[PDB]
């Protein structure tokens, strides 16, 4: 369904 | 505000009245409006050369880089004409100096097409590419040749020549700094080492220049340096390179950096360990295959072991690294599960450290973004009870990350959705639908919609949690994204049994759903709500009916459907406006004719005595004025201010309408 992934650079 | 307000702005700029442009915005509306050729009032103001119009158009908050149907920008139009003191006002407030159209030409491509003088000086100072040609294949230096004028073409080739010299001075310096990375003098090494890493901290293009100089193999070799100060700065440089695009990440991988970074995860020096975690986290921000290279290097067992670190700061970095790995596909997510991270991640949800709590929620949220068996692995690890408890956290960021994790779990099958329900999440979710935090509102609304898209048992549990009254109440929210997601939730609930569909309508949702559908534009949903029993004549507290909305928004299909279902064609709001008023003001000709066809009052006056002929004659809607006169519009009607429609056409400068009115009188 609503499968959201989140990335983060630093 | 209205489509009447931003009507003559387009021709006031094309004419050139600072005053008329000024009064057209004075009340406040759309600073940049539409056009048949996709133009905006900023484009035509710079084409004709009215400097007093391009400056007033951006001090209120418009957009300097607007595109038409061909991609033309205000800078492209300011260079075709040759107006200098109109170019820099665009360059001052962020304008695409190298903006490309569908033609491929640039402002300096066209500045040399006509051979313009001082306008090339300011675009080159702002970094205008002279080397990039169009799709024809003729550079700006070449278009000045074919024009027959080599005045500023000499300035074009010098800047291009100086650009070639400076790019080769950079490559000369970068190559020598890479050479100094092999120096036996540690002072000379670190001076070069810090310089390269500092350059790599800039944009993605500066990172490529460091890569193109061959710095990566030297930086990887420095990762085994006995000097921990050199080793730390080498880690800092590689981490800066890995913060760029996926191509730069892959170059770090192809340079063989991962085996050294994994080994550095066992370093007792916590500054070096933090930098290695920094570098690995940036590489794991890449695509799935770049995340997999980190996995294939054996980083997972060290990361999971770092989740038991006493150092709470190092623990946040290991969580950051794991969260990026779990942002990949199911193969990458399953590797994190197989490494044993879920038991440690669930245990970390009981940490009193709120920063560790957020970082642990991030990792679980990404793992829960995978397939159903990956979601089930999160459920099997016991995350749901801790997640539900975190919904009562005073920290709104921890609450927002917990809602995100619950939304990802609720995106699986009915068995995973039912697990969320069994953990007692719905009461907290329904209560969060009254949160003043609008971001928490959407997050709780996203979670409920995923639950509502399950079986009839999962839909029934949503109803039993009292969600319908709060969901119906959200249909009147000023945020339209909240209206839409609350509409989607109520639609998923209506897709259950006939009893569940009846409960949505006994909650009074059809009144507000019809209002939403009348504004959006799709008529089949309007037919749906009407067919299901929505009252077409129900007005708001303002007296606005669905027939008012579509006439204001310009939805001809909805206007016709509503009239076919017995909608009051002459319904009045609290101001006395009929749908004919709204359509004659916004300039929708077809809607005006349909209303008049269905018996709309051609001479109806509002509270201040304004007739539809007043609005059409005021706004420059020539065709609507003509149509109104055919249906018997009173040419001599006066509002409360003693203005006839002929007077209003004169006070607005609509001479074509004034000519028709003075002789139809």
Numbering used by the authors:
A (entry chain B): 1 to 10
B (entry chain A): 7 to 671
How did the manuscript describe this experimental structure?
dArmRPs are currently being developed as modular peptide binders.
To rigidify the construct and exclude potential crystal contacts to the binding interface, we constructed an additional C-terminal DARPin D12 fusion, again using the shared-helix strategy. Yet, clear electron density was detected for the disulfide bond, which confirmed the accuracy of our designs. Clear electron density was visible for the bound (KR)5-peptide, which was shifted by one repeat towards the C-terminus of the dArmRP on the repetitive surface. As expected from the design, every second peptide bond of the bound peptide was involved in bidentate hydrogen bonds to the conserved asparagine ladder, which keeps the peptide in an extended conformation. We concluded that the shielded construct exhibits an optimal curvature, since the binding of the (KR)5 peptide to the dArmRP was fully canonical and regular over the whole structure and extremely similar in each repeat.
